[PDB]
Amino acid sequence: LANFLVHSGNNFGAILSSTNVGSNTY
Amino acid sequence: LANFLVHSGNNFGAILSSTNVGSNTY
Amino acid sequence: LANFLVHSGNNFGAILSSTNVGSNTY
Amino acid sequence: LANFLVHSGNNFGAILSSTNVGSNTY
Amino acid sequence: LANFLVHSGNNFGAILSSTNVGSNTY
Amino acid sequence: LANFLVHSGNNFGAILSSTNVGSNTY
Amino acid sequence: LANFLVHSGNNFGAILSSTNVGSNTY
Amino acid sequence: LANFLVHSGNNFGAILSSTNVGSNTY
Amino acid sequence: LANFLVHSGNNFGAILSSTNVGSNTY
Amino acid sequence: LANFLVHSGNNFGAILSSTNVGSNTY
């Protein structure tokens, strides 16, 4: 069906794919 | 069907794809 | 059908694609 | 059918594509 | 069905895939 | 000032109050 | 100031209050 | 200032309050 | 300042308060 | 400042407070 499959009744969480997240604190 | 598949009844979470997120704190 | 597929009954979450998000705090 | 597909019954969330979002706080 | 499958009743946790997360503290 | 207060610079998200949302799929 | 306060620069997410959301799948 | 306070630069997530969410799958 | 305080640069996660979430699978 | 304080640069996780979550599987 798919390479990735998320099946839920209620969903509240984030879903990231091919993302670049970065944090810099000075 | 797809490379990525999200199937839910109620959805409340963010869905990111090929995104660049960045935070800088000074 | 698609490379990405979001199937829901009620949707409330944001859907980002190829987006650049940035925050700077001084 | 498409590269990205969003199928819902009721939709309330934002859908961004190729967008640049930025916030600066002084 | 899929290479990865997440089946739940209520979901609250993040789901990352092919993501690069980084933090730098100075 | 108020029981609920939403203060933003740019707003794009829906704001619901005392609403009844329902979806039925057959 | 308020019982609930949401202060942001850019807002894209939904804000629900005293809402009843329901989904039925057959 | 408030009983609940959400302060961000960019916001993308849903904010629920006194909400009743329900899903039924047959 | 508040009883609950969420301070972030970029926010993507849901924020629930006094909510009742329920899922029934048959 | 607060009874509970969440301070982050980028946030992706759900934040629950005074919530009742329930799942029933038959």
Return d(Cα B7, Cα J25) in angstroms, integer.
18
CB–CB of A14 and E14 under 8 A?
yes
Bridge partners, C23 (sequence order)? B23, D23
Return d(Cα I20, Cα J22) in angstroms, integer.
8
CB–CB of I12 and A9 under 8 A?
no
Residue among J24, C15, F24, A10 nearest H20 (CA):
A10
Q: Which amino acid is at J26?
A: Y
Return d(Cα G3, Cα I15) in angstroms, integer.
15
Supply φ then ψ for residue F23, to 5 degrees.
Answer: -135, 135
Residue B25's Cβ-side half-sphere holds a number of Cα atoms within 13 Å equal to 19
Residue F11's Cβ-side half-sphere holds a number of Cα atoms within 13 Å equal to 10
Chain E interface includes J26 (CB < 8 A): no
Residue J5, both tokens? 């304080």
Compute how many other C-beta atoms are within 10 angstroms of the C-beta atom of residue E18. Answer: 10
Residue in B closest to E17 by C-alpha = B17
Residues E9 and J20: beta-carbon distance below 8 Å:
no
Burial of J13 (0-12, 13-18, 19+ CB in 10 A): middle
Return d(Cα F20, Cα F2) in angstroms, integer.
23
Are J and D close enough to touch, i.e. 3+ CB pairs under 8 angstroms? no
Helix (H, G, I), strand (E, B) or coil at I12: coil
Residue among D25, C24, F9, F11 nearest G9 (CA):
F9
- Report in angstroms the alpha-carbon separations of H2 from D2, E13, G7: 45, 27, 12
Q: Which amino acid is at H2?
A: A
Return d(Cα G13, Cα H12) in angstroms, integer.
4
Residue among H8, I5, F2, H4 nearest G7 (CA):
H8
- How remote is the C-alpha of E14 from its chain's centroid? 5
Partners of A10 on chain I (C-beta within 8 Å) are 21, 23
- How remote is the C-alpha of D6 from its chain's centroid? 10
Supply φ then ψ for residue D23, to 5 degrees.
Answer: -135, 135
Residues J12 and E14: beta-carbon distance below 8 Å:
yes
User: Which ranges of chain F would DSSP assign to H, the alpha helix?
Assistant: none
Residue among E22, F24, F3, E15 nearest B21 (CA):
E22
Residue D12, both tokens? 């309330």
CB–CB of I24 and J24 under 8 A?
yes
Q: Which chains form contacts with chain G, at 3 or more CB pairs under 8 Å?
A: B, C, D, F, H, I
Min CA distance, I26 vs chain G (Å)? 10
Chain D interface includes G13 (CB < 8 A): yes
Residue in D closest to G21 by C-alpha = D10
Residue F15 is given by DSSP the state B
Chain J interface includes A20 (CB < 8 A): no
Return d(Cα H16, Cα D9) in angstroms, integer.
20
Are F and G close enough to touch, i.e. 3+ CB pairs under 8 angstroms? yes
Residues B7 and C7: beta-carbon distance below 8 Å:
yes
Return d(Cα H14, Cα H22) in angstroms, integer.
16
Q: Which amino acid is at J9?
A: G
Min CA distance, I19 vs chain C (Å)? 15
From which experimental method does this structure derive? Answer: cryo-EM
Helix (H, G, I), strand (E, B) or coil at D2: strand
Return d(Cα I17, Cα J15) in angstroms, integer.
8
What does this entry list as its resolution, in Å? Answer: 3.0
Strands D20-25 and J2-7 come out as unpaired
Residue among B8, E5, G25 nearest A8 (CA):
B8
Are J and G close enough to touch, i.e. 3+ CB pairs under 8 angstroms? no
Could you give the angle at the alpha carbon of F5 between the alpha carbons of G3 and J15, nearest 5°? 65
Contact pairs from chain I to chain J, CB under 8 Å: 82
Return d(Cα G26, Cα I18) in angstroms, integer.
29
Return d(Cα F10, Cα F25) in angstroms, integer.
35
Residues A7 and E4: beta-carbon distance below 8 Å:
no
